[PDB]
Scaffold this motif. Sequence first.
Motif, mmCIF file in Angstrom:
data_model
loop_
_atom_site.group_PDB
_atom_site.id
_atom_site.type_symbol
_atom_site.label_atom_id
_atom_site.label_comp_id
_atom_site.label_asym_id
_atom_site.label_seq_id
_atom_site.Cartn_x
_atom_site.Cartn_y
_atom_site.Cartn_z
ATOM 1 N N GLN A 407 33.067 36.039 47.830
ATOM 2 C CA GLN A 407 32.974 36.075 46.400
ATOM 3 C C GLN A 407 32.745 34.926 45.602
ATOM 4 N N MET A 408 32.347 35.139 44.306
ATOM 5 C CA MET A 408 32.456 34.029 43.220
ATOM 6 C C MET A 408 33.931 33.721 43.197
ATOM 7 N N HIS A 409 34.203 32.323 42.868
ATOM 8 C CA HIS A 409 35.584 31.880 42.756
ATOM 9 C C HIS A 409 36.256 32.505 41.649
ATOM 10 N N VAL B 175 42.250 46.319 47.523
ATOM 11 C CA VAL B 175 42.708 45.779 46.492
ATOM 12 C C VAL B 175 42.053 44.555 46.114
ATOM 13 N N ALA B 176 41.536 44.248 44.932
ATOM 14 C CA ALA B 176 40.889 42.802 44.728
ATOM 15 C C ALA B 176 41.740 41.670 45.101
ATOM 16 N N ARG B 177 41.136 40.633 45.608
ATOM 17 C CA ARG B 177 41.950 39.499 46.029
ATOM 18 C C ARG B 177 42.746 38.880 44.785
ATOM 19 N N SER B 178 42.312 38.970 43.491
ATOM 20 C CA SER B 178 42.933 38.578 42.387
ATOM 21 C C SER B 178 44.181 39.343 42.080
ATOM 22 N N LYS B 197 48.561 39.094 51.686
ATOM 23 C CA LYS B 197 47.222 38.429 52.124
ATOM 24 C C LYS B 197 46.653 39.600 53.041
ATOM 25 N N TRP B 198 46.717 40.679 52.957
ATOM 26 C CA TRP B 198 45.870 41.785 53.414
ATOM 27 C C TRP B 198 45.280 42.346 52.148
ATOM 28 N N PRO B 199 44.171 41.945 51.749
ATOM 29 C CA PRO B 199 43.527 42.911 50.704
ATOM 30 C C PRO B 199 42.790 44.179 51.253
ATOM 31 N N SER B 200 42.507 44.213 52.418
ATOM 32 C CA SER B 200 41.767 45.505 53.008
ATOM 33 C C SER B 200 42.321 46.106 54.349
#
Lengths: 628, 628
Positions: A407-409, B175-178, B197-200
Amino acid sequence: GTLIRVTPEQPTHAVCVLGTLTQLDICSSAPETSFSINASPGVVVDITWPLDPGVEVTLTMKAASGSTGDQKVQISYYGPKTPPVKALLYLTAVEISLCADITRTGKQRTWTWGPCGQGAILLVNCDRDNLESSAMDCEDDEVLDSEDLQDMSLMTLSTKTPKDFFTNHTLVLHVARSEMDKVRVFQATCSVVLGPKWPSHYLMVPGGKHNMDFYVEALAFPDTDFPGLITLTISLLDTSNLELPEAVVFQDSVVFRVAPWIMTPNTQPPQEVYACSIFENEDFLKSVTTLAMKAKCKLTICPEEENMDDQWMQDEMEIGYIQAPHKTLPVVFDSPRNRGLKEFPIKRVMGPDFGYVTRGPQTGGISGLDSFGNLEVSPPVTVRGKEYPLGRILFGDSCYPSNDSRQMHQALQDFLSAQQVQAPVKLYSDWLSVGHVDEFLSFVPAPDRKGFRLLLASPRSCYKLFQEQQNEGHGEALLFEGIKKKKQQKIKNILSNKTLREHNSFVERCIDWNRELLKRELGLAESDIIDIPQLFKLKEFSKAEAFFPNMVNMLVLGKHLGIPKPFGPVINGRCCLEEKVCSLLEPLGLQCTFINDFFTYHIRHGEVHAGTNVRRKPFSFKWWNMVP
Amino acid sequence: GTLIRVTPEQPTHAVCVLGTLTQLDICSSAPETSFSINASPGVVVDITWPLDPGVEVTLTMKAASGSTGDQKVQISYYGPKTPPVKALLYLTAVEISLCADITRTGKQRTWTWGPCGQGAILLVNCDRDNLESSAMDCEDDEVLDSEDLQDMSLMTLSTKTPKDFFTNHTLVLHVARSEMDKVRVFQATCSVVLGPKWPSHYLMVPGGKHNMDFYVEALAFPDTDFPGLITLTISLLDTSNLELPEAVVFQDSVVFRVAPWIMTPNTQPPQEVYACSIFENEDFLKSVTTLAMKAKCKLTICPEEENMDDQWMQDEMEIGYIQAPHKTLPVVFDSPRNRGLKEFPIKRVMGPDFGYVTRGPQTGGISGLDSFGNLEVSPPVTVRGKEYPLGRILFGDSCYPSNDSRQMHQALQDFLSAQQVQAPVKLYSDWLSVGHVDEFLSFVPAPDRKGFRLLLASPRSCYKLFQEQQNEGHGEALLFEGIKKKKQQKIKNILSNKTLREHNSFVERCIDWNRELLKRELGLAESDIIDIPQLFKLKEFSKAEAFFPNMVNMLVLGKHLGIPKPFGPVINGRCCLEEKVCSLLEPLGLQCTFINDFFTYHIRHGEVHAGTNVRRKPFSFKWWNMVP
Ligand SMILES: N=C(N)NCCC/C(NC(=O)c1ccccc1)=C(/N)O
Ligand SMILES: N=C(N)NCCC/C(NC(=O)c1ccccc1)=C(/N)O
Ligand SMILES: [Ca+2]
Ligand SMILES: [Ca+2]
Ligand SMILES: [Ca+2]
Ligand SMILES: [Ca+2]
Ligand SMILES: [Ca+2]
Ligand SMILES: [Ca+2]
Ligand SMILES: [Ca+2]
Ligand SMILES: [Ca+2]
Ligand SMILES: [Ca+2]
Ligand SMILES: [Ca+2]
């Protein structure tokens, strides 16, 4: 709003700022029925009256006062058999107006968007008008050059008071501590009165009529932790009593909105082309140099001494702009990728009337999707009613986050979304080795139906073209004709190649996903979209690269197009890919120049768009007239 | 949206998720006019047809498929003298529905506020149902108790597919990392599938009909850096080809909104009273104990062993709540002041069905305005059309920032504003030594006109009262009658005291500024407001303290009031201050108990409100039905 309490015991003394609501409490401290009011000529008492609390007595004053207490109000209390007891009120009227350009022409304490909204605009002073410097002008606490003031917002304080008024009153200018680090304010006769660790300043104002000009600069763009509003307030303080603290009598404010960073799509007329093709190549430059001149553009080039052998001028930066009624300037968004071109935006592009911004971590923790070939914008577009008159930023992501996905940061994504006027759209670009949206899309002008075409790369279109060619008897024709060092390949073997077809079937799937995504998020129909014949192959980690020069990765200089030379099969004296692209774009009025980028750019995973960059004209439509 | 490309050359195979728009591209890869379509019974082809691109062919399917490709579509191309060439399309229909409680009853990918809005609610799992623990339940990655699930939001995945479908397709939840650091998701049969720290996570789903329940908890309240929305998405992936990456076929989402922390005004019925008056005093407790019992409240008290001699139970904490359709619980906001009461909210108040939050720096950089006597809320109020059905947080500030001015810490202010449903209002409290809004205002219930009165402290009302008393011949009456150790003072000398009058004139100015501010920001009129007779004096740094027990700093337990005993001038067998307050509040149906707090609280700069705290009933009105 002010409630003045009057008494027969004592005369009250009070100040009335013009444009404020003053009321009288007559009841509370009355003696014992009925009452009458009589005021001096400059006081309109809107309202022989019964002494019950619920009756509103309001005083308004027509003009400022020449002296303290020069207007009077006399409240007479009477009744059954009691001779009048009079209570005195001496008023002093003053004008205190904090003014800014809230109608946004070059000249309420809430900022509202739209053609009927109010609120002054403030620019981030992120350029460098200072003669021989390296810092943005807003990094220090001085105005160093008179031309720097053009970037700032004027705010004036207009006072009309008695000559002796500030003997016993004082005016203070302030900004919240939560916002002081984002603004700086200078007083003009320049010196700082407000800023990052001075949230308030006592003004030195003489009585009578005075006007005091301030210049304001913003220090930060809107972001995750800054909606973009800055409030400055003037307070009037009664300092009449040497044995008591200051007492606030009146506050007034202006709300500024900081101008967002805004990108320019391919449909905005070009003004300056960038290439840093001073390296091993030379004929690449000749062709871009020609197109720039054709397009009437300044041309700046970055030499190998500066490049550090980084030819990818598209990738380190994106030239957008900021815009206010008083001032518009180009601003460069400097990507954190920090390769050979690292210094170029800070040293060569930032300068007089050229702003600078950057985001993301400067020393690692970056991926290829942070390079700005993965950062584009669409042309103006309306989507099921909602208008996007500056278009929509488009950037590339994966379809879901995994261990292997890029991803972009987030800091870059958050900045783009906080600019809130080109509401970003995430597209799927991670199936590409490099991973940039400019590897599968471009936009071009057109004289009809919306004013543009979306171009997508299209394996389907190339198979169709090659199959038609074979049908007409040209199966023997050679992809890569004219190339000294490459495995030449016949159309017939390209078509019988079952793995190539599988790969391009998967690429077609990735592109089609984005197609539909763009149809949904930009309100496009099929008639907005031209397919460009284009083949790919999967390579390391099953990631897509271009099989021949990726024609969609082109330079768009109005009607002048800089398309990478596909070294395609030559039929009837002419590459049939060139031919096909020309049959697609020439009827829109576009001139296609095919440029040899093969051993210079293409063999290194990019093309003409990747090796260039364009500064374009800012939209005439003013961002503040939008309703995001 | 999906555009399926059909060819006479090859049969295409495709999946159709029920509820999606499927169209056919017939033109692009046709041979050479005209065409006709024929489909199996379960496929409705809405649309003997000319072969021009602009004609929309749309396929919709009625039910899920029993087997792969069990529905077919046959496109016949014909024309002048050409016998039909047929192109085949084999379809497989599936149901993929990610469901949550988006109508908010206990059971679009955008969350909207209001009675007609959509979007599930998610609670921050900030309580501690775990038997013998110290951490909030959401601090780890396990569900430790079955009752913990009541706090979480149910989300179900409903698939109806052929028995063999997930041989070649797979479903992933992400879920998005954000946002992954703000949510955690468990799969039930509990174990974590998504989180910090498990986004998918790849789901293991069998073919045919299946239902898969997930439980979701939020980990952070809305704040400056978190609007409060969490998106979870299910993607369907084609993994049919062992020599190509996964290909996304369909994504669907639910958007959750995290529930804000919400305060309860004095007009909400009390449920539990807090005092930590285990210290040198004892009769103070007797009186609050009595009122609690009168008010039908649980009573919890903090002993001196825990107190560390900190008696100010009002100041370390504020009890609010969080609310979702499935679950409502009390939550304690723990102020950073961190005096003797430091541990009390974490050890005694946090627990089973009692949440916890805190903000601000835990080891310094705090002022007295961070203690939660400076944190209140108004009752429900409509302001020039705009409804605030949970009222408005009120907290104290200075009028402008200077070297000597105090504020509540920005982190606390930002948290309160990010809760966006009690839109905070800044009031002026810094003229007080202590500096809390509860030193000059309280709210009480009333059976008429809006349902409450704003009480303000009022020096004007006390001078009026004392003057009337002197007029009737009681000038000799003694303030501080009944007090063993204090300079007793006659009404007559109190009135002739010109400095006291000056001080109370300045205090009156500070209070009146807030009066008007409250009139503006709460839409109050004079008839909403009762003045409580109250004297102050300026002391160190000219800051205001109470001259006698600050009656407005009272405990409000419905109609039962706990007012500090002013030891006021005794006239006709009765303190005239008590008398005056009783004449003001008794006609609203309020019962005034005057409590001796003099040598315990008052001599240390606070009163009954300062020494207590109340948990109250949450509003029946649901915060999500608001339009902030
Ligand atoms: N599509 C663009 N806007 N840019 C593409 C740039 C391609 C470029 N390629 C390379 O940098 C490269 C390729 C082979 C050997 C050494 C370096 C990257 N990855 O940044
Ligand atoms: N109005 C309230 N909610 N609380 C008032 C609490 C007053 C309290 N007073 C004190 O803590 C105090 C006074 C004298 C000597 C030692 C300590 C402070 N400052 O916190
Ligand atoms: Ca400067
Ligand atoms: Ca400048
Ligand atoms: Ca850079
Ligand atoms: Ca400039
Ligand atoms: Ca770009
Ligand atoms: Ca847990
Ligand atoms: Ca729990
Ligand atoms: Ca604490
Ligand atoms: Ca619980
Ligand atoms: Ca409180």
